Design a protein. Structure first.
Length: 451
């Protein structure tokens, strides 16, 4: 099975020593095909890029979520949070059972008001820009998604729209993600040259924890009951174990939720807006839906649900640029992938989601084309062709949350503003552990529809 270029005893790893690893892996997948072996010092994985192989990798009886090395280093501050837990860790299923009810569509009804609060701030920010002033979309979308998660996660207002510099927690979080990412390429981590990087990391860990732990201490001491995630975690009992989440895990979940609602959802929104400004027909179509559906000053939960084409737009953005572009799997037992690639128990797989979503055998040759109409009816989408939210029980618990928020804000965006790609913006995808269109800027001309 094919393997990309090697670097001596570093094997393929230097390939990831790049600003854009996911995009690097995508061009490799284009070159080598539906599967290529990727080796690193003391590490081997197989990057899947075809729906044919990924539908099998997505067989949960055969493959379980693996923690990529990224998630393992993110586990250093997300602990046994849902996303950095192994399926077999008691806390995963515990936290999964406790939180699944907090992430359903019906759960969204409760979060809708808080999402709108933040969404209106975004709209008001843009309403208040001066002529010829532009929007830094990614930046503003991150302000929105991070504040949405804060408010919805634990009634905390990061007030990102009141800031140029991010909240101290977010400075530490983003810094720890960068350390986690950087340390994929670190051969000798204990080298003194990384003393301060590691000290900085422990500073960032100790920072996020104390700040999140206090918020949990604040809530439990005040004894107040909001309708946010944190209430559900303080009061939730895992029906299986019967146990509630202990404080350490709740904190890990909060940190987990804050990261997932940071640049991962923000990315979708930024990619969506990019594609909408690059495809005005799509924009017109989405904006006319937003105008037809969002007939009230502030969107209702039910109106957001009726933003079908906006959801299609989001799905098509998720197709071309899944902002969580990969998830790792391991073979629970000896198995053969596709009848071609024998896998031993424990062998690791990587689902290169952007590449899957470019599977011409599933979507046709125009995979690069942004056409939300691909998602007119989800029944036309084959099993496991579209996995921007992962797979099975380890799929994104926050998918409904992310889509409701993104549809909401996008709907409101299209309702209240005509958008101009005033720079003929050249899509430049910055890669952290998520994808975002770097330097994506637009001008938003208010439609002068009051809020
Ligand atoms: C469009 C935005 C989002 C995308 C594309 C996305 C994508 C994904 C993907 C692919 C996974 C599976 C990861 C894996 O298997 O390793 C996942 C897991 C997860 N996501 Fe999201 N996600 C998004 C938004 C959110 C938000 C807003 C939250 C906030 C709660 C969230 C929370 C989680 C959690 C907790 C997991 C782990 C679930 C589990 O393992 O049980 N995500 N996400
Ligand atoms: O798999 C992950 C973990 C992060 C992306 C997956 N992700 C994000 C949110 N949820 C899941 N990276 C991919 C791509 C990559 C490689 C090196 C450095 C950065 C990114 C890989 O390992 O090849
Ligand atoms: C990479 C980076 C961050 C996160 C994931 C993957 C899933 C949870 C949050």
């Amino acid at each position: 099975m094919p393997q990309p270029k090697t670097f001596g005893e570093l094997k393929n790893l230097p390939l990831l020593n790049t600003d854009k690893p996911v995009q690097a892996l995508m061009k490799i997948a284009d070159e080598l095909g539906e599967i290529f072996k990727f080796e690193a010092p003391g590490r081997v994985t197989r990057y899947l890029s075809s729906q044919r192989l990924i539908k099998e990798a997505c067989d949960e009886s055969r493959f379980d979520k693996n923690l990529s090395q990224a998630l393992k280093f993110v586990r250093d501050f997300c602990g046994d949070g849902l996303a950095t837990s192994w399926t077999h860790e008691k806390n995963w299923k515990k936290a999964h059972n406790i939180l699944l009810p907090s992430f359903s569509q019906q759960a969204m009804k409760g979060y809708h008001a808080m999402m709108v609060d933040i969404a209106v701030q975004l709209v008001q920010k843009w309403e208040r820009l001066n002529a010829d002033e532009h929007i830094e979309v990614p930046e503003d979308m991150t302000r929105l998604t991070l504040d949405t998660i804060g408010l919805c996660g634990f009634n905390y207002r990061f007030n990102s729209f009141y800031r140029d510099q991010p909240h101290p927690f977010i400075t530490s979080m983003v810094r720890a993600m960068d350390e986690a990412m950087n340390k994929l390429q670190r051969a000798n981590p204990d080298d003194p040259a990384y003393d301060e990087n590691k000290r900085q990391f422990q500073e960032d860990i100790k920072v996020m924890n104390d700040l999140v732990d206090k918020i949990i201490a604040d809530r439990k001491a005040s004894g107040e009951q909001s309708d946010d995630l944190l209430t559900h975690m303080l009061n939730g009992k895992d029906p299986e174990t019967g146990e509630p989440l202990d404080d350490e895990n709740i904190r890990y979940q909060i940190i987990t939720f804050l990261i997932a609602g940071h640049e991962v959802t923000s990315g979708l929104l930024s990619f969506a807006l990019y594609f909408l400004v690059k495809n005005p027909h799509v924009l017109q179509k989405a904006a006319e839906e937003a105008a037809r559906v969002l007939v009230d000053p502030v969107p209702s939960y039910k109106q957001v649900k009726q933003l079908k084409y906006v959801g299609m737009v989001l799905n098509e953005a998720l197709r071309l640029w899944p902002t969580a572009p990969a998830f790792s799997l391991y073979a629970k037992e000896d198995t053969v992938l596709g009848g071609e690639y024998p896998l031993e128990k424990g062998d690791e797989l990587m689902v290169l989601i952007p590449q899957l979503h470019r599977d011409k055998t599933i979507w046709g040759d125009d995979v690069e084309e942004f056409r939300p109409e691909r998602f007119e009816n989800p029944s036309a989408i084959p099993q496991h062709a579209f996995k921007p939210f992962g797979n099975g029980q380890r799929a994104c618990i926050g998918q409904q949350f992310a889509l409701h928020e993104a549809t909401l804000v996008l709907g409101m965006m299209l309702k209240h503003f005509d958008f101009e790609d005033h720079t003929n913006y050249e899509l430049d995808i910055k890669e952290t552990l998520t994808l975002k269109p770097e330097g994506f800027v637009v001008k938003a001309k208010s439609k002068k529809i009051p809020l």
